[PDB]
Design a protein around this ligand. Sequence first.
Ligand SMILES: CNC(=O)c1cnc(Nc2ccccc2C)c(NC(=O)c2cc(F)cc(Br)c2)c1
Lengths: 270, 999
Amino acid sequence: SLQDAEWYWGDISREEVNEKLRDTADGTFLVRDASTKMHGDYTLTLRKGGNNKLIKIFHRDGKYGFSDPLTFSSVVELINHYRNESLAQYNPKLDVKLLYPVSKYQQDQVVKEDNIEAVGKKLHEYNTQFQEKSREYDRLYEEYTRTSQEIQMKRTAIEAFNETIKIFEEQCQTQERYSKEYIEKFKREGNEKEIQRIMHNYDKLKSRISEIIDSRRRLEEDLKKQAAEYREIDKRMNSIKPDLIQLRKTRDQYLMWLTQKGVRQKKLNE
Amino acid sequence: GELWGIHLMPPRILVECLLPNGMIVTLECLREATLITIKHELFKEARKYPLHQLLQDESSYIFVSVTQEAEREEFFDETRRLCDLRLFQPFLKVIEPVGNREEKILNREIGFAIGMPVCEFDMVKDPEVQDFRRNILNVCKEAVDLRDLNSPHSRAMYVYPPNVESSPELPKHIYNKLDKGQIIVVIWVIVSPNNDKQKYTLKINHDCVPEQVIAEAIRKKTRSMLLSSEQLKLCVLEYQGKYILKVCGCDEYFLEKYPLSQYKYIRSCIMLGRMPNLMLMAKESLYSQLPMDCFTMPSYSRRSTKSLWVINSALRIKILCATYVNVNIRDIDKIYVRTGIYHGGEPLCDNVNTQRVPCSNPRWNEWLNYDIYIPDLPRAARLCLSICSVKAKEEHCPLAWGNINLFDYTDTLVSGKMALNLWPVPHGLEDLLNPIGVTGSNPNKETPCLELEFDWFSSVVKFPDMSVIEEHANWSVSRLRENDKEQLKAISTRDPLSEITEQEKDFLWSHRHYCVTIPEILPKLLLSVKWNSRDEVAQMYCLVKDWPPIKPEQAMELLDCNYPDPMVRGFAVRCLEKYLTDDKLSQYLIQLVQVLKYEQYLDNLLVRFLLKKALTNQRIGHFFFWHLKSEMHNKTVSQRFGLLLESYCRACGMYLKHLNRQVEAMEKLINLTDILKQEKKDETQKVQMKFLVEQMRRPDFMDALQGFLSPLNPAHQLGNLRLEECRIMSSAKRPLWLNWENPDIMSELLFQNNEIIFKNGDDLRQDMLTLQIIRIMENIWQNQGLDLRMLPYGCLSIGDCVGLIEVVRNSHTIMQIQCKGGLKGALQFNSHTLHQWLKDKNKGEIYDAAIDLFTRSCAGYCVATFILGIGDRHNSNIMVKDDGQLFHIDFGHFLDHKKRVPFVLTQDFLIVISKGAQECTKTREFERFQEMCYKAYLAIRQHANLFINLFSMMLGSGMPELQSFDDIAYIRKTLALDKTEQEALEYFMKQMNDAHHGG
Ligand SMILES: CNC(=O)c1cnc(Nc2ccccc2C)c(NC(=O)c2cc(F)cc(Br)c2)c1
């Protein structure tokens, strides 16, 4: 029967099946009743070439197929025929067989007694564990971007310190270029007074250059330390992501026990 | 701040001055002292220091210092104040000036405009960057030559372009508000040195041109002068050529011969039933305020291989190693890099990965081999890759990503070793690859860097010239019908995101030659091409070379991320530059800017088209600048948009002077709000208010915030501040409510005051897109004849979570109006309080008009919000004017909060719609109210393709609401595009009767 088949999921959306053939191997397959929501009309989707290639299953006189010449009695006969041999005799550029299905209940990972507390208690537990970890992930990404911008603000500030220090160093190298032989002249004229005016200003020049040089390393220190705490926030998020994804799926598929009955009462308590 | 870590300078500070001799002089100088004053007093004080004998004359030097942008800036413009220099530290180095002064002064002004120094571009190694800077300067001279052509008129047409609808053809409901096909309009004339003016009322055809309006006015005044037919002509000739018309209260002018009813101001005066007030103004006065503005070429402007189709080998790439990967070695098992070869969003071949590797040693040295023949590569092929971790069940995650163009902008195939820094993976994305992301290396330092090597084929390899591509098509093509006709047309009807199966696409590829009879099919046919086959691609190139032009609303789809081929995109651009009006360009400019992110290279037909238009029309140029400037913080496009902004500012003429006055205004406001956001957040509301008024009363602030143009609409001058009425607001991020006087000579005829909200802290680009989308729906309904009045108020993002919002005068929230009423039920507000307040503000005959306006506007927002999934709004998110017009606000707030009702239709609204009746859902007012909703719903569904394209073009924005096409699928549900009309209509009715709950 088609109604009970592994690979017939029913009225799934294109986005929900795209989410299910993600990164899958060539040959994974899945069929829906067409999104056009018309009775007895179906679409096949399988993975080939990193793409989800859709094919329409035409229906006429109770027969089935996906081409104008139409043959098969049921979709299960149409599909199992191409689980066996290559579909390349039709639309020949693709050739992979209908290898691997994905099914609607072959992953109901509920362990023990099927009491309803497996939903009314264990679902509320995972969903609580999910929103807590999702709140931490969002908080991480907030201070992650905050630390990211405060870093480039410091990187440009030290880069500015570099230009100010470059301009003060050239000032010292021109102070010695144009004062060297004025010192040597005041030396033999016995004018220690003027020599100490020049030196008093030189000492003041390379006294302030030391202040901004210190201001730079003091900022480079804050950058080194904030840059490291940024890397930590990164690896922490990368550690939280696969966990957050794992217990999201677990929370999602524990609605199976809720969908088994198919009415909101057992979540309506929450 | 005026100094690093300092908002304002004290009134007097010490400045370390470095002389050409190695003396250092401390100069105490006023905060406001101009550099001319600094230099003259410095060399006046220098005579007190050694070695003054070596100093040349004061005039032989300028100042150079380091700005807070880390730029060594030469201060050629010595007229600036010490505090405007944006100095990093308070010091000045004296040097002899070198280079062109005028260029240096102009570059600094450009740096302030685009928010980054122009000299940072001079340092870029990339040849693509330097070629772009030089190769679009001809687009600049094209534009300047064109607008300087017929001076002064051509120059006025650039600064004050006609604001007109795209078609003069009025719809019936607009034409019906004309007095037997005519409009009554008043002409004003300032007539006194004191400014005393006068008015002349006219009744004229709606389709008269401005020169004919001036003829009827001078004809009406010369009524009793006893002029001969020819004497009347001469003075009509005198005034037609000597005066032009201006809108009273703003800077809009009627400079070309569109019919009067096509100018938007007057199309609305008819639509709203208001009086068009115009001012007759001298042309020599208008041309006086258009100072001549030149354009000079900058300094940088002036100063063997084999084909891809000969390479007999499959594609392979070597992935070497990674660096700086941040991963917890004890929580994560191993890492591997994933790769794929893409053309847009469709893998050209199956993905392949490296082997998994310890986190402590990211090194592979693997040659990844791809199932694609090198000649089969399309030009727009891209390598997309990421580094992925893995953690019982096995589950993977991406750590960082990066995309690469297999061909560069010179058409050459990449070869040799390559190393690119990867980008962070965006919030909420689990896909292991990000193909829609930009192509390029992340400039931020200490980020995961990945190294590769591309095969080297003994020489440089280039993509084949178009010459041989067409011959390969002639080679492969050698290797009517009826019922098929109706299906092909049946496929053009389906939306851009409709499901297209294999049988349908190769059926299109089979009848690809018949498709040119239904050009609307081109996007569907292009997705049908097997792009990893050089046979089909070549055959397809020949089809698009001769494709009939499709209209812009369809051509824009071919600029989105699913159509990366340069020939396809080139065809789309040519469609726009020959069918897209400046009106519709100005509307769609939001989308058209951000499809530039999908452009593979800097220099492309699309940017040259938008840049050409921005330099020949100063209205679209204004928002062209701000939408680019608003994204400068984003490092994925800071360079592309930066280079593009440089060119625009270098050729937009005198308007750069005005733009910088806006930038400075926003830079002052963003500073005050940043202060209130952190330095004073810890203090009271009244304390913040007292700091505001004190800070705003300062002269430098008033001189920067008074007398500039409104970025929301440069036609609005912003004059003096009504400090009387400006204030902070109760919102948590505490924005500023600002009020300016309208300095127009006749401001009293439009508005005497202009009120705007400035919000620093909230992402406004959602409200922009939503308010824009609402304006599209309103324009559709109006063109169809549905007089549903929406209020897409002005809203402009200018940067990272900062922008402006237009205040709607005489408007209140439904929450405020409920608080004006009283309680009826147990603690329940009175549902009739809304209807009562409306009657208070609208007494007598005008009541019915207010009810009709409410019912029409309400119907519009019900349909709009439902389709866009903005259903449940707080009663403080809904607003209504005294006018009776209803509208919504704070759309981003709604999206930011959503991380049950289809649309808000509370009893309060139902009362006023039914004019206060019992069982209001069974009256004939409600009967024709939901008939408006139904017509409006299917009216939008008829245009569903346009909206889906507009949102598809925003995917690269980085708006978390638009990360994948799956996000856009919601609008296919609300519009029920996988169902027919009567099915969609029944779906919408079903939904509204859940908003009413069926009682
Ligand atoms: C309670 N609401 C929902 O459940 C919901 C679900 N899917 C949606 N998809 C969707 C559809 C059309 C356009 C854009 C998007 C993202 C939306 N719409 C938006 O989020 C939206 C609407 C705008 F007008 C502007 C911006 Br910006 C974002 C809402």
